[PDB]
Design an enzyme around this catalytic site. Structure first.
Site, PDB file in Angstrom:
ATOM      1  N   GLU A  74       9.786   8.338  -3.617  1.00 19.58           N
ATOM      2  CA  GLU A  74      10.861   9.076  -4.278  1.00 19.58           C
ATOM      3  C   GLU A  74      11.623  10.081  -3.408  1.00 19.58           C
ATOM      4  OE1 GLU A  74       7.922   8.223  -5.876  1.00 19.58           O
ATOM      5  OE2 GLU A  74       9.186   6.677  -6.792  1.00 19.58           O
ATOM      6  N   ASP A  76       5.603   2.419 -13.405  1.00 26.44           N
ATOM      7  CA  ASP A  76       4.480   2.467 -14.348  1.00 26.44           C
ATOM      8  C   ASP A  76       4.771   2.425 -15.847  1.00 26.44           C
ATOM      9  OD1 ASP A  76       3.196   2.768 -11.853  1.00 26.44           O
ATOM     10  OD2 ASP A  76       2.901   4.935 -12.126  1.00 26.44           O
ATOM     11  N   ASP A 100       5.829   2.159  -2.022  1.00 24.64           N
ATOM     12  CA  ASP A 100       5.548   2.910  -3.241  1.00 24.64           C
ATOM     13  C   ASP A 100       5.534   4.420  -3.023  1.00 24.64           C
ATOM     14  OD1 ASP A 100       4.916   3.085  -5.995  1.00 24.64           O
ATOM     15  OD2 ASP A 100       2.772   3.209  -5.546  1.00 24.64           O
TER      16      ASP A 100
END
Ligand SMILES: CCCCCCCCO[C@@H]1O[C@H](CO)[C@@H](O)[C@H](O)[C@H]1O
Ligand SMILES: CCCCCCCCO[C@@H]1O[C@H](CO)[C@@H](O)[C@H](O)[C@H]1O
Ligand SMILES: CCCCCCCCO[C@@H]1O[C@H](CO)[C@@H](O)[C@H](O)[C@H]1O
Lengths: 691, 691, 345
Positions: free
Chosen positions: A321, A414, A318
């Site tokens: 990016e 999300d 997670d």
């Protein structure tokens, strides 16, 4: 300088002297005869930028670009490819977490692919700057892109997958029902919840452990109070045949007595001036691994391997990016006092501009290779599974770049629970799917909890989420810390039963889904597909977005509204209504008859749970266990002996009996219109005949 | 919980259960028969604070508090004790770099000391909140302070020095003429400059190398281009009898391949939450050594020792308040663009509030022990000299706390060249001196260059700086990067000659200065002193600030204006004009007769360069080489045989001849009024008689 | 110093030396043979704060906390108890206007109540900080709370009501159909509207008069032009069997010739340094009655009584969180001209 290489309908165009974020092998570098003009491209080199132009016709369709919060046909928008923590994203927000610089053009029914191998902030202006042009701007002086001939969309994806990498084949349990939350703890509660779920009839494949399990958010540690006995926890879940997937961020805490920090020293990201890049993330002050380096990858693989050895079954990557919060926090500290409202610029969460990496021995700016960061992290994590001689691999990633399909599943981050989100999630997963990433899904029920008014936590919407993702490869329920408990066991019987039946229906189709997964890992065909993928020659198909194909045979039109029924658009050909047996002629609009609108295409073979089998028309299908099934005239051939419980044959012409291997005859029963059933319950040497 | 101990005029008052920044060994641990009432103190304990009150009479004088940009008598001001990078400080700015929480009260001619052993942000409200009170606020729930009986100010300082530590005895060359700049480089230029200085007659004791000598500001490294051959430089300078002092900051660069960062790991400062305290300093992103820890001090001593082994002669500790720029830079990044101006809050350069240290095994907040940080750094650096078996120790520090005198010289930081600064520097060094730190000085010519309008670079002002610090212990010329070249060799002959004569005069008095340095290290008496130190019973003396005593015998009234002469206030007693030989009666005001107004007190013995000796009246004096000289009725006794070149006797009664050891006789030549000279040029076994 | 008392199923837990916002008399006390551990509670005293912990099971339900813009089962949220003018509130906004520091736990079908008698900014972290815990933080060094046995939810409420006070019994017309607006005026229009309502068949029990009826928003005054003859209005309404309820705010206008300001002098709220607390509300610059005092309460009762004597049937207390706008206005004056957007705190 301009070079063009050809081979297998794939032209590699090289502008200048490119330094790709990753090198993709070409098994035949033959100089091409075709020129840019025969390729229909215009190229310009300017101030450290390369602009590639292509004309765009009125009827031309543009698809791809991966994870985009937009309609599947991408015309009339300027897209930015830059991995970013989107936060509580809404529709039409760009960019998002994943960047796949690939788009397919379908003109006059013929598809052609264009893949720009740059992980920098690439701009795809699709008929916006110039109504009749597709302008691609790469913020680099050199670049390599590929023109991938079709003519079928499937043809483009096979070649693309051949080029960037075939999807890995995950274990069948990776497609099961996963429960997750941010977060479940302490360890006794995790087991209590799994027990209640199983006791009430929910087959749970695995549970995800979010960041609360760590000690002060330190990677590869267990919270001393919530998880004092990790071995006990692990054995209890395995005892219940439940896998354990643990989240792993990318931030290493700058802690003097934290092992990973000390052992990783020398392999972290730096800034232009030479110091380490020190930022902010969950554990506080942090440094980040420079995954572009081979050695950093080896070091990471080691930690992962060691982590997997306790019995952890999967890794959930997670914030990769990669995301950083030092800039946001810096702003919040200086202007905290001021009673003014800040603007939400998501780009503030990306790495600063002075960050550098070492790619293939060369020092490069983060902005030139940013989007490939998650790819290299996934690569190292995959290597970690190999180091552990773990054959069943499961990796979930939030961000990605071309090639990410080699190592991980991708979920849409999300999302916010709402009726509109149902349509949004469908565009997101389908965009990803049509862009080379087959194993995808979204958080069932939506991630956002109750931190803002525009969140809808009604139970019937929750049920619609479960139904929406019925056939998505990745099926997980995940919810934020302050969100209501969304596990099925906490729902009133009315709703609980509906979720229960939906999950059971998913497991009933798992064999088919898994067979498609095998097909994906072997040929690069996506599991779920937009209608235009199978019917690219019909313009209407590019406007249908609340429907999707599961493989080549099943059409699913989920109900994405409060209505009890909906209008279903059927493509050309005949379709069999799974629930009532009706066969309708394609290229028409019909009203749904069941809560889960499923239709089988004429020429389908679908393996179901418990060795069941559905056959409609003539086609050939390869089951996940390698068994090939073929249907023709009135014969169903099997590549090898296999057990068959219940056989369902849909046919407009009556079927009185079937014959197993020329000898035994099994009683056929008409259960409903066009539907004939035969309870075989026995192994079949090689064939079945219909009469 | 109140406890009062006592031992030889030093009451130790303990409130609650104190955890001192440093523990000072008290000879005995005898309990006291005195109560707070008897001691004239009132104490209050509140919200984690201790308030100590004392009355303040109209005629009562308050002195001390160390480095304060205020008048020597501290009444009518609220002082804050918090080490801070003052920047381009001006008069009346508070706080500054050093914090000595000691003040002496002189009431009815009797002195009493009050030392509060807390390195937190202590407030000394001297007759400001309450006109008739001295209120001391310590931001801690517990505290230990001492009441030090006099009755002479010198008595207080001896006891204070006994308590916190005697000043180390530095080498004689540490008091010589030092040249410095920010900075001198490359290495060839350093030698070229030293050569020109020596060739033109300037005796240079040492040169200071500022941060430009480092590689990217990395501690313990040499710039590969400016100083590619440091060993060569050190020999070139040592060959010329010139010492080399190198600056050493406290910031360790967060660099993956920087040795000190890797070896210091585990010994750096942290923040409340457990991560390392990462800040900003010269080398960029940096961490800081937690000098409060025993092991950190060892590690540092090792690096210092290793650094000294190349032949470096001294260490210059800078920015050790400790200072950090991350907060300032954070503000500048968020509001850079705004056309708005920023207020200059110096407190922004201190360590953040969440920083913690480990003192004697206990975890404490930085704000509780901040001021002692430089003390522990100096301690570790001093230990580094011991580790190198280096007997000649030289350490310069910018910041400090009580006890800093054990390990280093202190200079007044970044002053601004201007006529007013002449008076300011005098208050700064005298305040430090009367507070237990004897070896002090200021940057001759002022540090600030030309980065703002209010800077005066006139040459006659520069000459006045050289003259002002004529007798200061630390005599160094230092200038900022963009300031004009201030080395004497670059001045027009007119000014160059004046500086040359002033420096020669300093070397002529070096023997006396060094003897006072020995006295300081043995008894804790300051070298330079305000007039009230020797004449504490005369109220007038507390208003005289442009005059100072060098030892007990010499009064110097530097010219701190453009005038050619000035009014000189002489204390009680008789004074001898050093240049014209005239004698004047004390408690009067006279006009200066020379550019350098020097007066000798009746009862003086002054050893001069080249074994010269001046004697006026009866007194006893211990020379730095241990030889004690005593003058009585008409006899000068020597504790041991010593050579004596020229002897000068000042006397109102004529002196026709002197007799060496009751044997040989030498003729006396009156050179000017009250001045008699005898060219002895021979060893003296034990005495000289006058006739 | 933590003690526990008991009385008919009500355990009174005292931490330190509490000074309750209001004292609730608990009759036949007597110390309890019960312990915190038995009671299933953990207590910690720190920097002027008291933290009370209780475990929270997966199937355990938490209800109560009064006026919350959230689902009735309160798990997975950190609630703040601080009366505030919520403005145009939306769902999931917290806190709101009312603060009832009471929550009921229902475990294995058995209910137990927990009432923390503190009117400070109490935090109820219900399975958010720790998934398996209910953590209550009281920003005071001392506090008194009660554990109220059930086992029925109704049992808990009876005991709770016994403790804090039984609801008063209002007249039957108080439950009738009331019409209101911000605002109805002048007085003739009020009667006209009531007449049309009745003529068309709507049985109106009473009408509410909002702030436009006052003279410059001054409490206990009638607007000289909109309401020149209040007696006539009251009689007209009563003839039609319609009650009249008038709004009454808590702000007293700092007006030299305003009676309530002059008579209330001595009974207004002050600030730490001793001056009166002067703020901003509808009437402009205003002071506020310190209702915690007996004399203020008596003085107020007098004004109310006098106000009711004209024939007013009910009182509508508004903005009594208490709310003040001086801070908001201060911000709006300083950054007024700046072309930016203020956050809504
Ligand atoms: C700071 C808020 O930041 C958000 O926090 C969430 C989890 O708390 C993450 O999932 C989001 O990606 C992040 O943007
Ligand atoms: C940033 C300006 O900061 C100043 O820089 C000077 C040297 O450049 C230091 O000597 C001062 O202490 C510092 O405050
Ligand atoms: C100033 C806006 O403020 C609002 O005004 C409303 C009435 O106008 C009140 O009911 C609200 O409570 C108040 O917040």
């Amino acid at each position: 300088i301009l070079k063009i290489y050809e081979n297998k309908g794939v032209y590699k165009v090289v502008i200048g002297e490119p330094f790709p974020p990753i090198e993709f092998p070409l098994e035949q570098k033959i100089s091409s005869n075709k020129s840019l003009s025969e390729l229909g491209l215009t190229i310009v080199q300017q101030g450290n930028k390369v602009i590639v132009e292509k004309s765009l016709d009125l009827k031309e369709h543009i698809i791809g670009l991966g994870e985009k919060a937009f309609e599947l046909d991408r015309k009339r928008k300027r897209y930015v490819m830059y991995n970013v923590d989107a936060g509580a994203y809404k529709k039409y927000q760009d960019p998002l977490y994943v960047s796949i610089p690939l788009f397919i053009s379908v003109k006059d029914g013929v598809a052609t692919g264009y893949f720009f191998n740059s992980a920098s902030k690439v701009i795809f202006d699709v008929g916006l700057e110039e109504y009749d042009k597709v302008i691609v701007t790469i913020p680099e002086d050199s670049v390599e892109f590929y023109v991938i001939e079709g003519p079928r969309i499937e043809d483009v994806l096979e070649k693309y997958t051949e080029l960037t990498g075939k999807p890995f084949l995950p274990p069948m349990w990776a497609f099961g029902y996963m429960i997750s939350r941010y977060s479940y703890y302490p360890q006794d509660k995790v087991v209590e919840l799994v027990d209640i779920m199983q006791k009430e009839g929910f087959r749970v494949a695995g549970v995800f452990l979010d960041i609360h399990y760590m000690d002060s958010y330190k990677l590869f540690t267990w919270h001393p109070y919530r998880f004092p006995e990790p071995k006990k926890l692990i054995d209890e879940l395995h005892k219940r045949n439940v896998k354990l997937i643990t989240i792993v961020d990318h931030g290493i805490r700058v802690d003097q007595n934290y092992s990973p920090f000390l052992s990783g020293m020398g392999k972290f990201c730096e800034i232009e001036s030479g110091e380490l890049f020190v930022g902010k993330m969950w554990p506080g002050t942090t440094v980040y691994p420079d995954f572009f380096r081979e050695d950093t990858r080896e070091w990471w693989a080691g930690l992962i391997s060691e982590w997997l050895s306790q019995g952890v079954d999967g890794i959930w990557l997670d914030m990769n990016e990669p995301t950083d919060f030092s800039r946001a926090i810096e702003i919040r500290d200086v202007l905290s006092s001021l009673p003014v409202q800040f603007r939400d610029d998501r780009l503030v969460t990306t790495f600063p501009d002075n960050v550098v990496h070492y790619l293939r021995g060369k020092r490069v700016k983060h902005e030139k290779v940013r989007n490939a960061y998650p790819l290299y992290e996934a690569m190292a994590t995959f290597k970690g599974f190999r180091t552990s001689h773990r054959n069943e691999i499961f990796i979930l990633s939030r961000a990605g770049y071309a090639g990410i399909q080699r190592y991980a599943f991708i979920w849409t981050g999300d999302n916010t629970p709402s009726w509109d989100d149902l349509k949004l999630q469908l565009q997101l997963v389908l965009g990803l799917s049509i862009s080379g990433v087959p194993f995808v899904g979204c958080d069932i029920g939506g991630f956002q909890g109750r931190n803002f008014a525009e969140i809808d936590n009604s139970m019937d919407l929750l049920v619609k989420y479960y139904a929406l993702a019925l056939f998505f490869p990745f099926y997980r329920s995940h919810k934020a810390t302050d969100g209501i408990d969304t596990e099925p066991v906490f729902l009133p019987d009315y709703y609980k039963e509906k979720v229960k039946e939906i999950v059971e229906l998913r497991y009933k189709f798992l064999p088919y889904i898994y067979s498609l997964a095998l097909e994906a890992s072997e040929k690069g065909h996506p599991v779920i597909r937009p209608l235009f993928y199978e019917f690219q020659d019909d313009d209407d198909m590019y406007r249908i977005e609340d429907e999707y194909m599961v493989g080549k045979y099943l059409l699913y039109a989920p109900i994405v509204s409060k209505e009890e029924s909906r209008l279903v658009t059927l493509p050309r050909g005949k379709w069999y209504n799974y629930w009532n047996g009706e066969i309708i002629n394609g290229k028409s609009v019909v009203k749904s008859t069941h809560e889960l609108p499923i239709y089988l295409r004429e020429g389908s073979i679908i393996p179901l749970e418990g060795d069941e089998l559905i056959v409609y028309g003539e086609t050939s299908f390869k089951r996940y266990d390698n068994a090939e099934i073929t249907s023709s005239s009135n014969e169903i051939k099997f590549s090898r002996e296999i057990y068959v419980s219940k056989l369902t044959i849909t046919s407009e012409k009556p079927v009185s009996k079937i014959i197993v291997d020329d000898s035994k005859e099994i009683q056929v029963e008409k259960t409903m219109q066009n539907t004939y059933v035969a309870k075989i319950n026995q192994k079949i040497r090689g064939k079945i005949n219909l009469e």
